[PDB]
Amino acid sequence: VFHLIRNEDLIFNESLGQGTFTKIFKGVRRELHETEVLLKVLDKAHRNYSESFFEAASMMSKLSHKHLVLNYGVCVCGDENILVQEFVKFGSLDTYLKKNKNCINILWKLEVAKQLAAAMHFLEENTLIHGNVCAKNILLIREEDRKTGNPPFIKLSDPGISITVLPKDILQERIPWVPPECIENPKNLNLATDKWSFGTTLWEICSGGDKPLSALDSQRKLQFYEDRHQLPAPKAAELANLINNCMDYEPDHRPSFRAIIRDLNSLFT
Amino acid sequence: FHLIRNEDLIFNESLGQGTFTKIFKGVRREGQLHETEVLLKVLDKAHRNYSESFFEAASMMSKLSHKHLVLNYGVCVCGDENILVQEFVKFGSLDTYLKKNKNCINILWKLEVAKQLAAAMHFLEENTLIHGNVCAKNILLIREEDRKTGNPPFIKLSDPGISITVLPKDILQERIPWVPPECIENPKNLNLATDKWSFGTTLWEICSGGDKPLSALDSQRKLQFYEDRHQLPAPKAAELANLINNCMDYEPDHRPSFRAIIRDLNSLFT
């Protein structure tokens, strides 16, 4: 479901901040059914990024999976082209991780990875490239009910603005999420890209929400890939092996999400 | 509502302009190749306020299928621009075709076209779908009449374009007599009855060898025509004068249904 949602049917509320060329607001849609939704308002300055920001969310709308956020449609809401998608109560994971680095143990982290890998495998099967996998773009639907054992639940946000059109300056600032082959030529974006980013994303999860290579600058980030280094194993290096397998400078050596799911399940609960 | 990547769109010839649109013959690119001939309508950023209407004009035009409706492959929220991708009908608009071969077309040729048109309108009426801009221009000729092969012409109805519910009154008044009197005094009166009126006027074009009714009248003399409650003169052929008037009934509730319009057209043996 990807419809041309009208500005008349959208009510904006509180702003959740801004992002990569977007202003984020909580709102409501009127279809009569009123439904809470997330509104990513593409700034008018960067309005030329719409041909990929929304076309990607569109293809993700055609597919169905319990771990893919629902992208409802688009609005030519005035001077801005806006994305209307499902709202997630607890927001991005990268923040939730840092806010609860201690309480979050190994079992909690493992279930999240399984849920993510499931969505990535789904995308791989459907051959849909995300291009922006990261603990930021992972949204927490449900917390862990320890006393009841209820597992957490996550949903993968929309693909976003393609890295095939973003400026090279921000691509280098996005290392180690943007894989090497894409830094070399952005037109190398392929399914293998998300495997690398999955490794970087897994590092975030194991690191209690920390950010890989936050201290380095773009030039030093460029050298890390030049020297073909690898991310360090977090303080809880139970998954360190799988990270490096995904962050493999040879794209064809990065394991399929089918095999990755097996590894994750092999780690027991 | 399918979104296409701009790179896949290859502009070529320019087919003039439409209602706040620049028309281009182009190609779609899409695994080996995938070169599809298409029609490109570009909505300027100066006219971004007509986005919802310009898009919705083709959105619902595609949610259903019919052999006499043009197929819209997709659109682009291309940022600065907004583009519509639809099938390219070879021979172009019917109004022009009728004039280019005015002294060479017969009634059976014209009547066959009317039935095809009514068929499309009937399909739309059943689905509670309003076109809003029925005219010989928005009618595109797929195939010519092959006398030797004894096969008929074929046509399709293009999208409505930007809805008259948002166009300026100056445009509406100039679109008379295609805009029904009830919409000239309130565009929000647009309903299924609007198309029956517009259909009758479109038939008048067909019978007139491609000419356009009320051409030598300004928008002010056109307004008096509706105020005086006049009717369009009978065509030189004079076969469908009644059906036109029946369709162009100043009372919307009395305008016939396309179900019945098809019977009368089928009833016209000639």
Ligand SMILES: Nc1ncnc2c1ncn2[C@@H]1O[C@H](COP(=O)(O)OP(=O)(O)OP(=O)(O)O)[C@@H](O)[C@H]1O
């Ligand atoms: N679907 C959503 N539901 C709830 N909160 C969301 C949703 N999408 C984004 N957010 C919130 O947006 C903030 C982060 O936005 P973010 O930077 O990911 O936006 P963006 O423009 O999509 O970025 P990018 O395309 O670079 O990933 C966080 O508060 C996150 O909780």
Ligand SMILES: Nc1ncnc2c1ncn2[C@@H]1O[C@H](COP(=O)(O)OP(=O)(O)OP(=O)(O)O)[C@@H](O)[C@H]1O
């Ligand atoms: N689908 C099509 N296939 C082939 N030619 C087309 C098609 N649509 C338009 N054209 C050509 O474009 C010319 C002008 O187009 P037209 O005026 O119908 O555009 P428009 O933007 O749809 O306008 P309007 O909103 O006023 O109906 C037509 O005479 C015809 O030559």
Ligand SMILES: [Mg+2]
């Ligand atoms: Mg995001």
Ligand SMILES: [Mg+2]
């Ligand atoms: Mg048209």
